[PDB]
Amino acid sequence: AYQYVNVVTINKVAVIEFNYGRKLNALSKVFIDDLMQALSDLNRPEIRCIILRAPSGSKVFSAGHDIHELPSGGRDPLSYDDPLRQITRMIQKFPKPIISMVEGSVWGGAFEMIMSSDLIIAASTSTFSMTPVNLGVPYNLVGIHNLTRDAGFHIVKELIFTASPITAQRALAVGILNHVVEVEELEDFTLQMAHHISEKAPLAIAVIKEELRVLGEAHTMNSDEFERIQGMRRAVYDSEDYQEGMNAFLEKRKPNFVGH
Amino acid sequence: AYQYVNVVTINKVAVIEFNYGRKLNALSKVFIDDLMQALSDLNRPEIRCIILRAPSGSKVFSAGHDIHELPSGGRDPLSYDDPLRQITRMIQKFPKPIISMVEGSVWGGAFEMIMSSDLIIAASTSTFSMTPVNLGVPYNLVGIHNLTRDAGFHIVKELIFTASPITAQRALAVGILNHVVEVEELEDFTLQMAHHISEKAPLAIAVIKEELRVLGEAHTMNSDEFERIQGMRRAVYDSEDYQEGMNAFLEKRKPNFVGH
Amino acid sequence: AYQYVNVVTINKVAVIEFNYGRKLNALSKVFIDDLMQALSDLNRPEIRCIILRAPSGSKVFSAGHDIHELPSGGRDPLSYDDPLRQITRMIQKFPKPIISMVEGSVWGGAFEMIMSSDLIIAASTSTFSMTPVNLGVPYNLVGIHNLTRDAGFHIVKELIFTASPITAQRALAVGILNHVVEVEELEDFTLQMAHHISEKAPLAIAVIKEELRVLGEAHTMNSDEFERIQGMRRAVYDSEDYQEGMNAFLEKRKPNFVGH
Amino acid sequence: AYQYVNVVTINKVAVIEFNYGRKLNALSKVFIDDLMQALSDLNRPEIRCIILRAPSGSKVFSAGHDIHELPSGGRDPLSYDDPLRQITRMIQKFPKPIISMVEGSVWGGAFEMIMSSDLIIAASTSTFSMTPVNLGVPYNLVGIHNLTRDAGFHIVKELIFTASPITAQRALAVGILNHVVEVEELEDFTLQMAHHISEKAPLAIAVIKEELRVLGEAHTMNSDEFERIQGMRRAVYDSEDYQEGMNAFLEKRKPNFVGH
Amino acid sequence: AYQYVNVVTINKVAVIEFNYGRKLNALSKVFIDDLMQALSDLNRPEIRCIILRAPSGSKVFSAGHDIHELPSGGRDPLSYDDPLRQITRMIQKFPKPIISMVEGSVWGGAFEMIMSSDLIIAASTSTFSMTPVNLGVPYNLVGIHNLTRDAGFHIVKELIFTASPITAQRALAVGILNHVVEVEELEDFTLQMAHHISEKAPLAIAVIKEELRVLGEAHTMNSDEFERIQGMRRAVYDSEDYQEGMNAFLEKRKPNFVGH
Amino acid sequence: AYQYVNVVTINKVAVIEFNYGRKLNALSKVFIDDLMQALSDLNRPEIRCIILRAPSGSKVFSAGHDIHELPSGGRDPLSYDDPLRQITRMIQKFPKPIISMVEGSVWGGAFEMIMSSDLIIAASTSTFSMTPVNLGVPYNLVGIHNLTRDAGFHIVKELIFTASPITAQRALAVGILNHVVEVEELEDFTLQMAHHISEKAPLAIAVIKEELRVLGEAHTMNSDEFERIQGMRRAVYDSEDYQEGMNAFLEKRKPNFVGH
């Protein structure tokens, strides 16, 4: 059993349901460690497809990164072993398909988390925002890359630069979602597709998923370019604005950004 | 003349029509060798645009890889000089635009074949499936990469992991197709576009096509990553599941996959 | 302050308006030098978002490359320091969002220019074409790469190989545009999005934009592939067809291309 | 204990000594499994430097790949999980320096193995050969790359194309070896260098070793190039020459190669 | 015109002499800023070649990184705008050849600095060491890469893992140095070569140097590999060993490293 | 027969001897066309090794690129189809070893040509120079890359920036040559090694040569880097210095370079 998730398996399909609603399923270390343990426990030959979901009737699918656990001490907020960074790698390397079944609003790191999964099926009332420019966070290269494989560059830059929510209808139209259904059809539609996938050849699915993962990462650059980017990110996480972003969030007020 | 295609030339446009209805235009070696000979013969300055089509009225555009020619046991079924691998490279390197004009159902390797062409114009009643997970086939890197340049990652993964057919309307909406037209207008519509392209500067078209080919291919990885992927693909084509998929296809029964 | 653009600032938003209507805002060296000086002058902490536009009522947003300024006699027409190549780099490296607010028709290098910007909001009556195959021009790798980050390969190849205009509605559908609005609403809609972006964290916006730029460029090739392409481009700029394409534009007649 | 190796620790230095002299320390699966187990068991904070050696007085350091374990059956002889391929990866990813201390003759896969290690210190009487052209073996990309980081291309090609042994003195002159010493001084010279390295910062050593490993692997190519090489390798392991080379070695006669 | 360097111009050759003897030409910000200003001021068409030197008679060419300025606690010591990182970029991008003319002992960052220059001519009594493993420093990817273009991997790993000094004779034998001369001949030999270079075509020299720079940097990797290495680097600069290495250097005692 | 080369076959070895003494075996278009035709004619299974040589007693091995065939200005002098660019690709792709057997002086493009071959065996009196900085020529990336796989960067930069000849003894010490022998021993020393290689497995040699070729080329960069380099090379071939370099050679005088 798990403190922060609930797992139900029938036949070859496992549903991992978030159980962290008192914190709006924020991506706290304790929540992510339990989600990763649950996925690892399901890495068995008789499990063929995973669904990730919030409880039925959730207003908020996930509030994203826990803003209390963001470092404000001049440390990289999105280093390789940060919980958000660990869960996106683990989803992408997992040798079974992972479907995000979305009811409610999706924020920031949680939007990256569902974009790292294999398919997204969403309620017609679900909404999606990408929020680092609301907090002054310098998103990392891997995290940004995870957002660029579905919608085009102009659409991705609108989502990030405005931090404005988009509807499930627009998220379908721009190529982010696989399917949008009425919320009362969401579970039945998603289970039908998951159980269908579980009848197909699992070893062929696993190697094709791994081929897609490698090709998706195969945007290569030299060491100088990476180190130049890391210097730019460091200047951001050393900024007055980054302190103001976090301060405004916990004081429940609007940040005032100034460009330092 | 050719045993397995019929070629017609109208000014600067060449139409190559499959003549392999006996096997529903399956990508047999003898069919692909005639298709490649026909294209090579058309590599002349006075030809400016190619159309690939099945005969008018076809229910099946192409049934995909000839399953009777797929290597059994531990032989790579999608090696460099396999017919499907040869025709996709030839289409992509050919210095004139190649338009796939689609009537009927499109399966597996024939879907990768039309995706490798420059433009796809299809009948409102045409349908599209990608089927290696039905058979347990470890699709190759180059073949998967050919499926990723039009629709986004989540859509591609739905197509491959479900092996379910999509309509021409959905294939248009997700960016696979250029145009969908009523079947009685398909030929006229496609020829009008081909004649129009044929008025443009062919050397400019050829170098821009090759620039897009090179950029499309420019997802680079180290030797270890390629050899690791090759080891995973060999484990799949060595598996009981691969034998079961091939056998189930031939015996016309549902395969029973077990994950080894 | 500039001969060929007008700049107005509204709180933290700067609007750079073309003032070259006597040449339909063609991308002449004198125009681009003024556009680049205006952008450089706006790289100030109190400026948070840029809008590029043509004057209200413009039938032609930009007629594209100044065809009089293209070299004739066996010279690369799209070298690293040609004005179109300079302005796309400058837009992409600029540390503030640049929104292209489009009224009227967009041609050739002007289409590449708006594609290189961060967001595109367009009038319902605006139209878009990519024209090098009309003139026999061997477009450069960087230039072509700039057209491939929004719509899929089949769509881009139709746009380039036909040189046919598409509508604002089709450009929205295929992923080129962010928004299409009635022309009477175009300025207010674009200014409210720009003001909204202007309240977000500028340093987070600048590092995410730069991360997207270098991931966008990170399609890598070996020296031989680049030099093989450059040799193909030189055969095109040495061709009879290239001279005929330039001649026909200047003599206002239909070119006759022959494939050498 | 181990059946096929003997381990001695001298404070922070561990010496792994081959114990397979009855098969001239050929790289059979049982010998390599024991070497990898002994390395894995030494991956402890109190160990800082490894030495690999043959027993004192060995005329043969290692006879290379066990030719009885080379598959002939149209199967890739150097696939990702073959013992030679496993041991070179493990030596390179091991977070402590590994020094090859060589007495006797070094052959084929055993030469690649010492090349994959961090330093090579050798007896003045030791000799070195790279032998796949004697057998008709299509050596794999990773394996060849492991031979190209010390001596230059012309020297590597002489070694491989001639399969002729070189002296310790020539191996020093061309950059393959760190040091050549009289056999009576070999053990002490090597131990003093290992003890000296063991006084330095182990975390600094490990991250610099890992940085050198990933820069050394960072020669990148597209999927088509890898698949094209793999097709060429398969044609070699399907060849009559390959069968002739294996049979000639086992029958102790000169092979007769004919080029198919 | 400079506090910390002296500049002598002989025909088209400029000789930049270090004037920071108080810290044995350690790479303090104040010294490096004056070295970079002097180089910038020499970027004129009438200057064709640069020589970098310590004063005639120097025991110590440069004592390396200023250990008093290296950030301690959890700050990256080798960030993009650290003085050593700036000076190696500037030397490599400088459009004239830069010859390191070496008398005395060369340590750590000063060794990387001379390795980044175009040619090295040294006195027979000069000596060379690479020192990060004496301090527990996690050297950065670009810094390590700068050390791998002259001697082979085994030799570079000996230099870095031992931090032992090598003689000029050995540095010449492994390919680090161009020439070794008696100290009395150092100025005559170096100036003769610099004068000879200055009669050659400067624009051909500049573009070839820049071609070599970009080919040298063209070892590419994906974002995940870079972020993984940066996480490992951060674990080292957070370590107790790193604090011990810095403290031991400042207290002029032997460090005791423990592996955390 | 051939107008400009003489070919002899000794068992399985073919010796191609230059016959263009009248321009000292300068790499004129018609000379290189016959060398390439002679190689193609020898691409047969009963030939296993090629030797390239000048006639016995030659003072000049080859005077390098034919300076008279270089363009006068405003054109790239080393385009993909140039004869030097053609012969180095053909040597590198040729599926049999090519040994350069060198007697006399080797200049410029002929030095690149022998560097592109597999092995170099040279007379003790032979000499070697790299000459583009004598003429003001902007060497191409592929050409420079062909000079970097044997000697280190410092040595290569000395050779190119000085254009000074080096001895066979120095070329051996820095890793350019395989062997140096007295001129009376050169022919039979080289034939002994070629006969020995000719008894080895030719398919294994061919796939290993090709693996080394693609690994050598696998230094990758983005389109913007390449086009930036090309623009810099264009500024050189457009310069006054390039025309001065060509004029000085024609007028048999020392050039006066001024840096524009």
Ligand SMILES: CC(C(=O)NCCNC(=O)CCNC(=O)[C@H](O)C(C)(C)COP(=O)(O)OP(=O)(O)OC[C@H]1O[C@@H](n2cnc3c(N)ncnc32)[C@H](O)[C@@H]1OP(=O)(O)O)=[N+]([O-])[O-]
């Ligand atoms: C990777 C990344 C990232 O993941 N950033 C975090 C992105 N998340 C967000 O921007 C969403 C932040 N929260 C909200 O917008 C709203 O809380 C919302 C999710 C719509 C739920 O609104 P709702 O009215 O239902 O509840 P609220 O009154 O807003 O807030 C409910 C409580 O949850 C807290 N909370 C909400 N989200 C978070 C979070 N992500 N981290 C920490 N606390 C949170 C609020 O501070 C309140 O705290 P407290 O007053 O009890 O101490 N990034 O780059 O920024």
Ligand SMILES: CC(C(=O)NCCNC(=O)CCNC(=O)[C@H](O)C(C)(C)COP(=O)(O)OP(=O)(O)OC[C@H]1O[C@@H](n2cnc3c(N)ncnc32)[C@H](O)[C@@H]1OP(=O)(O)O)=[N+]([O-])[O-]
């Ligand atoms: C690259 C790849 C790939 O290309 N795989 C193959 C993908 N192709 C398919 O899955 C489609 C397989 N075929 C079918 O679904 C059906 O034949 C269909 C195309 C719907 C047409 O049905 P239709 O009723 O009109 O004809 P069928 O009864 O299904 O089949 C008529 C015959 O054609 C054979 N056949 C059909 N497609 C193929 C094929 N691709 N290869 C070999 N034989 C085939 C069947 O096995 C039958 O053999 P036989 O009983 O006459 O000896 N992959 O990775 O798997």
Ligand SMILES: CC(C(=O)NCCNC(=O)CCNC(=O)[C@H](O)C(C)(C)COP(=O)(O)OP(=O)(O)OC[C@H]1O[C@@H](n2cnc3c(N)ncnc32)[C@H](O)[C@@H]1OP(=O)(O)O)=[N+]([O-])[O-]
């Ligand atoms: C990068 C690239 C590129 O940018 N190519 C250029 C792409 N641009 C174009 O194809 C548009 C060319 N022009 C046109 O299509 C039409 O001018 C159009 C924009 C529809 C406007 O029609 P309109 O009926 O008003 O014609 P005008 O207003 O008279 O245009 C006024 C003059 O502008 C000239 N002109 C138009 N576009 C251009 C241009 N790009 N360069 C130079 N002159 C131009 C016409 O030839 C007229 O010459 P002249 O009569 O004064 O001697 N490329 O690869 O090709």
Ligand SMILES: CC(C(=O)NCCNC(=O)CCNC(=O)[C@H](O)C(C)(C)COP(=O)(O)OP(=O)(O)OC[C@H]1O[C@@H](n2cnc3c(N)ncnc32)[C@H](O)[C@@H]1OP(=O)(O)O)=[N+]([O-])[O-]
């Ligand atoms: C990866 C790779 C590779 O690793 N190739 C293998 C490269 N190995 C070689 O070329 C070593 C060839 N062997 C020799 O030169 C000599 O056997 C040798 C290493 C010098 C020592 O000679 P010595 O005179 O002491 O002993 P030998 O009489 O030659 O041989 C002693 C016995 O060991 C066997 N043997 C030697 N090397 C091997 C091997 N690598 N695998 C299996 N058996 C071997 C011989 O066939 C004899 O078998 P048997 O007939 O008694 O059953 N490759 O690509 O080729």
Ligand SMILES: CC(C(=O)NCCNC(=O)CCNC(=O)[C@H](O)C(C)(C)COP(=O)(O)OP(=O)(O)OC[C@H]1O[C@@H](n2cnc3c(N)ncnc32)[C@H](O)[C@@H]1OP(=O)(O)O)=[N+]([O-])[O-]
């Ligand atoms: C990049 C990197 C790196 O660069 N590491 C640093 C590597 N450098 C070293 O290990 C050499 C450190 N310095 C020394 O060992 C000695 O100064 C040595 C070069 C042997 C010369 O000894 P000598 O007795 O002649 O001269 P010293 O009195 O030690 O040194 C003369 C003065 O320069 C200072 N100094 C010398 N080296 C350094 C340095 N690297 N950083 C800061 N100050 C230094 C000393 O503290 C003295 O200052 P002060 O005590 O008068 O205020 N790394 O990764 O580690």
Ligand SMILES: CC(C(=O)NCCNC(=O)CCNC(=O)[C@H](O)C(C)(C)COP(=O)(O)OP(=O)(O)OC[C@H]1O[C@@H](n2cnc3c(N)ncnc32)[C@H](O)[C@@H]1OP(=O)(O)O)=[N+]([O-])[O-]
């Ligand atoms: C790629 C590249 C390159 O390959 N450059 C070319 C590099 N080659 C050189 O710099 C060598 C130029 N030539 C010389 O230095 C001398 O000719 C040398 C090879 C030392 C031989 O001196 P030598 O006094 O014996 O004989 P020469 O009479 O000078 O030369 C015999 C004739 O061949 C011509 N020749 C010699 N080298 C070349 C050449 N590379 N191109 C064209 N003609 C040449 C001379 O101009 C003579 O013409 P003519 O006077 O009969 O009409 N690059 O970038 O520069």
Ligand SMILES: [K+]
């Ligand atoms: K709004």
Ligand SMILES: [K+]
């Ligand atoms: K300054």
Ligand code: NI
């Ligand atoms: Ni990509």
Ligand code: NI
């Ligand atoms: Ni390299």
